[PDB]
Design an enzyme around this catalytic site. Sequence first.
Site, PDB file in Angstrom:
ATOM      1  N   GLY A 206     -11.856  -4.978   6.568  1.00 34.61           N
ATOM      2  CA  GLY A 206     -12.753  -4.517   7.614  1.00 34.61           C
ATOM      3  C   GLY A 206     -12.541  -5.123   8.995  1.00 34.61           C
ATOM      4  O   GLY A 206     -11.593  -5.868   9.235  1.00 34.61           O
TER       5      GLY A 206
ATOM      6  N   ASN B 248       5.443 -10.926  23.128  1.00 35.60           N
ATOM      7  CA  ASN B 248       4.900  -9.778  23.828  1.00 35.60           C
ATOM      8  C   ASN B 248       5.523  -8.426  23.447  1.00 35.60           C
ATOM      9  O   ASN B 248       6.709  -8.346  23.104  1.00 35.60           O
ATOM     10  CB  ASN B 248       4.974 -10.030  25.325  1.00 35.60           C
ATOM     11  CG  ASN B 248       3.965 -11.055  25.773  1.00 35.60           C
ATOM     12  OD1 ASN B 248       4.172 -12.257  25.634  1.00 35.60           O
ATOM     13  ND2 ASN B 248       2.844 -10.579  26.278  1.00 35.60           N
TER      14      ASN B 248
ATOM     15  N   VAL C 102     -11.356  -6.047  12.453  1.00 39.39           N
ATOM     16  CA  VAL C 102     -10.058  -5.887  13.123  1.00 39.39           C
ATOM     17  C   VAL C 102      -8.986  -5.403  12.165  1.00 39.39           C
ATOM     18  O   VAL C 102      -8.652  -6.081  11.198  1.00 39.39           O
ATOM     19  CB  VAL C 102      -9.581  -7.204  13.740  1.00 39.39           C
ATOM     20  CG1 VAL C 102      -8.216  -7.021  14.393  1.00 39.39           C
ATOM     21  CG2 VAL C 102     -10.573  -7.684  14.752  1.00 39.39           C
TER      22      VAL C 102
ATOM     23  N   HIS D  74      -2.282   3.588  18.575  1.00 42.33           N
ATOM     24  CA  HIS D  74      -3.177   2.788  19.417  1.00 42.33           C
ATOM     25  C   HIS D  74      -2.529   1.444  19.775  1.00 42.33           C
ATOM     26  O   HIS D  74      -2.679   0.957  20.896  1.00 42.33           O
ATOM     27  CB  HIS D  74      -4.509   2.558  18.682  1.00 42.33           C
ATOM     28  CG  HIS D  74      -5.508   1.732  19.446  1.00 42.33           C
ATOM     29  ND1 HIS D  74      -6.562   2.293  20.136  1.00 42.33           N
ATOM     30  CD2 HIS D  74      -5.663   0.389  19.560  1.00 42.33           C
ATOM     31  CE1 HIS D  74      -7.322   1.340  20.639  1.00 42.33           C
ATOM     32  NE2 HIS D  74      -6.799   0.175  20.310  1.00 42.33           N
TER      33      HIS D  74
ATOM     34  N   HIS E 230      -7.811  -1.411  26.317  1.00 44.17           N
ATOM     35  CA  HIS E 230      -8.833  -0.488  25.853  1.00 44.17           C
ATOM     36  C   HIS E 230      -9.441   0.387  26.946  1.00 44.17           C
ATOM     37  O   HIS E 230      -9.735  -0.073  28.047  1.00 44.17           O
ATOM     38  CB  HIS E 230      -9.925  -1.244  25.102  1.00 44.17           C
ATOM     39  CG  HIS E 230      -9.458  -1.805  23.796  1.00 44.17           C
ATOM     40  ND1 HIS E 230      -9.874  -3.032  23.310  1.00 44.17           N
ATOM     41  CD2 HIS E 230      -8.602  -1.310  22.872  1.00 44.17           C
ATOM     42  CE1 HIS E 230      -9.289  -3.259  22.146  1.00 44.17           C
ATOM     43  NE2 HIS E 230      -8.513  -2.234  21.863  1.00 44.17           N
TER      44      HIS E 230
ATOM     45  N   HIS F 263      -0.753  -0.496  23.370  1.00 49.52           N
ATOM     46  CA  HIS F 263      -0.931  -1.868  23.845  1.00 49.52           C
ATOM     47  C   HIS F 263       0.426  -2.500  24.141  1.00 49.52           C
ATOM     48  O   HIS F 263       0.594  -3.169  25.150  1.00 49.52           O
ATOM     49  CB  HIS F 263      -1.668  -2.717  22.804  1.00 49.52           C
ATOM     50  CG  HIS F 263      -3.138  -2.442  22.718  1.00 49.52           C
ATOM     51  ND1 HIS F 263      -3.950  -2.406  23.836  1.00 49.52           N
ATOM     52  CD2 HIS F 263      -3.960  -2.265  21.656  1.00 49.52           C
ATOM     53  CE1 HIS F 263      -5.204  -2.224  23.462  1.00 49.52           C
ATOM     54  NE2 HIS F 263      -5.239  -2.136  22.147  1.00 49.52           N
TER      55      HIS F 263
ATOM     56  N   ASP G  69       0.764  -1.264   0.000  1.00 49.46           N
ATOM     57  CA  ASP G  69       0.000   0.000   0.000  1.00 49.46           C
ATOM     58  C   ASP G  69       0.785   1.298   0.000  1.00 49.46           C
ATOM     59  O   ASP G  69       0.395   2.269  -0.629  1.00 49.46           O
ATOM     60  CB  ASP G  69      -0.914   0.097   1.235  1.00 49.46           C
ATOM     61  CG  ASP G  69      -1.707  -1.150   1.499  1.00 49.46           C
ATOM     62  OD1 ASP G  69      -2.076  -1.869   0.571  1.00 49.46           O
ATOM     63  OD2 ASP G  69      -1.986  -1.428   2.683  1.00 49.46           O
TER      64      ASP G  69
ATOM     65  N   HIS H 266      -1.094 -16.087  10.357  1.00 54.12           N
ATOM     66  CA  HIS H 266       0.238 -15.561  10.159  1.00 54.12           C
ATOM     67  C   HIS H 266       1.289 -15.955  11.177  1.00 54.12           C
ATOM     68  O   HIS H 266       2.392 -15.432  11.134  1.00 54.12           O
ATOM     69  CB  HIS H 266       0.175 -14.038  10.020  1.00 54.12           C
ATOM     70  CG  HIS H 266      -0.489 -13.357  11.177  1.00 54.12           C
ATOM     71  ND1 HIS H 266      -1.857 -13.299  11.316  1.00 54.12           N
ATOM     72  CD2 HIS H 266       0.025 -12.717  12.251  1.00 54.12           C
ATOM     73  CE1 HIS H 266      -2.157 -12.653  12.426  1.00 54.12           C
ATOM     74  NE2 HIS H 266      -1.032 -12.288  13.012  1.00 54.12           N
TER      75      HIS H 266
HETATM   76  C1  LIG Z   1      -9.417  -7.315  20.063  1.00 55.94           C
HETATM   77  C2  LIG Z   1      -8.590  -6.340  19.236  1.00 55.94           C
HETATM   78  C3  LIG Z   1      -7.784  -7.090  18.192  1.00 55.94           C
HETATM   79  C4  LIG Z   1      -9.507  -5.331  18.539  1.00 55.94           C
HETATM   80  C5  LIG Z   1      -8.890  -4.257  17.621  1.00 55.94           C
HETATM   81  C6  LIG Z   1      -7.948  -3.340  18.424  1.00 55.94           C
HETATM   82  O1  LIG Z   1      -8.337  -2.645  19.388  1.00 55.94           O
HETATM   83  N1  LIG Z   1      -6.635  -3.423  18.188  1.00 55.94           N
HETATM   84  O2  LIG Z   1      -5.806  -3.067  19.287  1.00 55.94           O
HETATM   85  N2  LIG Z   1      -9.999  -3.547  16.924  1.00 55.94           N
HETATM   86  C7  LIG Z   1     -11.250  -3.180  17.653  1.00 55.94           C
HETATM   87  C8  LIG Z   1     -12.488  -3.923  17.204  1.00 55.94           C
HETATM   88  C9  LIG Z   1     -12.512  -4.950  16.186  1.00 55.94           C
HETATM   89  C10 LIG Z   1     -13.769  -5.568  15.798  1.00 55.94           C
HETATM   90  C11 LIG Z   1     -15.002  -5.148  16.444  1.00 55.94           C
HETATM   91  C12 LIG Z   1     -14.982  -4.119  17.471  1.00 55.94           C
HETATM   92  C13 LIG Z   1     -13.720  -3.503  17.855  1.00 55.94           C
HETATM   93  P1  LIG Z   1      -9.403  -2.459  15.744  1.00 55.94           P
HETATM   94  C14 LIG Z   1     -10.747  -2.084  14.526  1.00 55.94           C
HETATM   95  O3  LIG Z   1      -8.396  -3.196  14.966  1.00 55.94           O
HETATM   96  C15 LIG Z   1      -8.724  -0.842  16.338  1.00 55.94           C
HETATM   97  C16 LIG Z   1      -7.490  -0.348  15.736  1.00 55.94           C
HETATM   98  C17 LIG Z   1      -7.036   1.018  15.959  1.00 55.94           C
HETATM   99  C18 LIG Z   1      -7.808   1.919  16.795  1.00 55.94           C
HETATM  100  C19 LIG Z   1      -9.023   1.421  17.407  1.00 55.94           C
HETATM  101  C20 LIG Z   1      -9.487   0.056  17.199  1.00 55.94           C
HETATM  102 CA   LIG Z   2      -2.963  -3.731   2.113  1.00 55.19          CA
HETATM  103 CA   LIG Z   3       8.617  -8.608  21.579  1.00 57.14          CA
HETATM  104 CA   LIG Z   4      -9.341  -6.911   9.083  1.00 52.98          CA
HETATM  105 ZN   LIG Z   5      -0.777 -11.323  14.959  1.00 50.61          ZN
HETATM  106 ZN   LIG Z   6      -6.790  -2.018  20.502  1.00 48.58          ZN
END
Ligand SMILES: CC(C)C[C@H](C(=O)NO)N(Cc1ccccc1)[P@](C)(=O)c1ccccc1
Ligand SMILES: [Ca+2]
Ligand SMILES: [Ca+2]
Ligand SMILES: [Ca+2]
Ligand SMILES: [Zn+2]
Ligand SMILES: [Zn+2]
EC number: 3.4.24.17
Lengths: 173, 169
Positions: free
Chosen positions: A79, A93, A81, A119, A129, A123, A25, A69
């Site tokens: 879409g 970790n 995650v 974000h 969260h 973590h 991308d 992966h």
């Molecule tokens: C469980 C975790 C992989 C969820 C993940 C996330 O917070 N990455 O740290 N996701 C939250 C999520 C997924 C599906 C349905 C509701 C909410 P996202 C879309 O990847 C996420 C990524 C960046 C900012 C906020 C959220």
């Molecule tokens: Ca891509």
């Molecule tokens: Ca590490």
């Molecule tokens: Ca995805």
């Molecule tokens: Zn992974």
């Molecule tokens: Zn998150």
Amino acid sequence: FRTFPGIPKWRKTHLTYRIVNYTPDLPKDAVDSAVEKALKVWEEVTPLTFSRLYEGEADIMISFAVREHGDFYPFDGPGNVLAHAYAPGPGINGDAHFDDDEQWTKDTTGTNLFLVAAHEIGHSLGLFHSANTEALMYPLYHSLTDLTRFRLSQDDINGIQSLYGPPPDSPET
Amino acid sequence: FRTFPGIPKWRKTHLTYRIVNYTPDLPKDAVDSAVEKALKVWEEVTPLTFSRLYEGEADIMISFAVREHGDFYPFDGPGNVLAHAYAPGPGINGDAHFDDDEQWTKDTTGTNLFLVAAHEIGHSLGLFHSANTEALMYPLYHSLTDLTRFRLSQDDINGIQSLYGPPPD
Ligand SMILES: CC(C)C[C@H](C(=O)NO)N(Cc1ccccc1)[P@](C)(=O)c1ccccc1
Ligand SMILES: [Ca+2]
Ligand SMILES: [Ca+2]
Ligand SMILES: [Ca+2]
Ligand SMILES: [Zn+2]
Ligand SMILES: [Zn+2]
Ligand SMILES: [Ca+2]
Ligand SMILES: [Ca+2]
Ligand SMILES: [Ca+2]
Ligand SMILES: [Zn+2]
Ligand SMILES: [Zn+2]
């Protein structure tokens, strides 16, 4: 703000990161830049600093991935995650994987790499969260238009500082 | 109560302070008093004693500033950030800066200098922000009835005594 059970945090104030692979991308420069800026938002408010490794194991291994992966949690395709990162500790970790079935972008026309990386590095540093709607650590990526107006909310600051504290060169209001 | 990372504190009981400049908002006697009453709230609960200097570098240098002043952290105009102070150590550390774009008063009709100075000198001695809502070190301490019903909460007392101990009497 929430943390992970046991409150796992790094012991070192200086961590290393490595960008394991690259996405189709964006050009390589855009990826490295978005990663540096994501780490930078956390350095600003803590005594943490980060350096780059190009070989060997770095605390925060960053990669892009699709479906299965090599870890316990597969990605779901376009879409939902967009990415996932682990709490501090050895090995797997602190690592931050990004779903390549998303369209990673420098701006807001797909999924901004910098926003999500910020974000995730949260973590990787020990924040789970948040229950606070406008915190970067709130689990809802959404319709944002201004990267120009990016300032970590008070909740994120209070959360990462409850683990690491504020920078030593910073005065406290 | 919270303490800064690496729990930095002063490796001595006697500290010096210096009021480098003065605010046009208030007479000089009120600034000195507000600062001296602010030092006293901490002295009363720890073996810490203070002395004033009028030249040289004091541990706690106190000044009034607007926007960009001697550091990397400029003030933001009226309201919001009222003042900021550094944790213990040499140089700029321990120093308290006050925003003159605020209207410093000795009562509750603008930004009360005593209340803010007590909080800032908290930072200067090694206390970071507290989660307790009625403690001086809580971010929103700007509500407390600053002279009539002011009392250092047990939380602030606990916090400062963790670093310096109870009075030696
Ligand atoms: C469980 C975790 C992989 C969820 C993940 C996330 O917070 N990455 O740290 N996701 C939250 C999520 C997924 C599906 C349905 C509701 C909410 P996202 C879309 O990847 C996420 C990524 C960046 C900012 C906020 C959220
Ligand atoms: Ca891509
Ligand atoms: Ca590490
Ligand atoms: Ca995805
Ligand atoms: Zn992974
Ligand atoms: Zn998150
Ligand atoms: Ca000093
Ligand atoms: Ca201000
Ligand atoms: Ca003023
Ligand atoms: Zn404060
Ligand atoms: Zn300053």
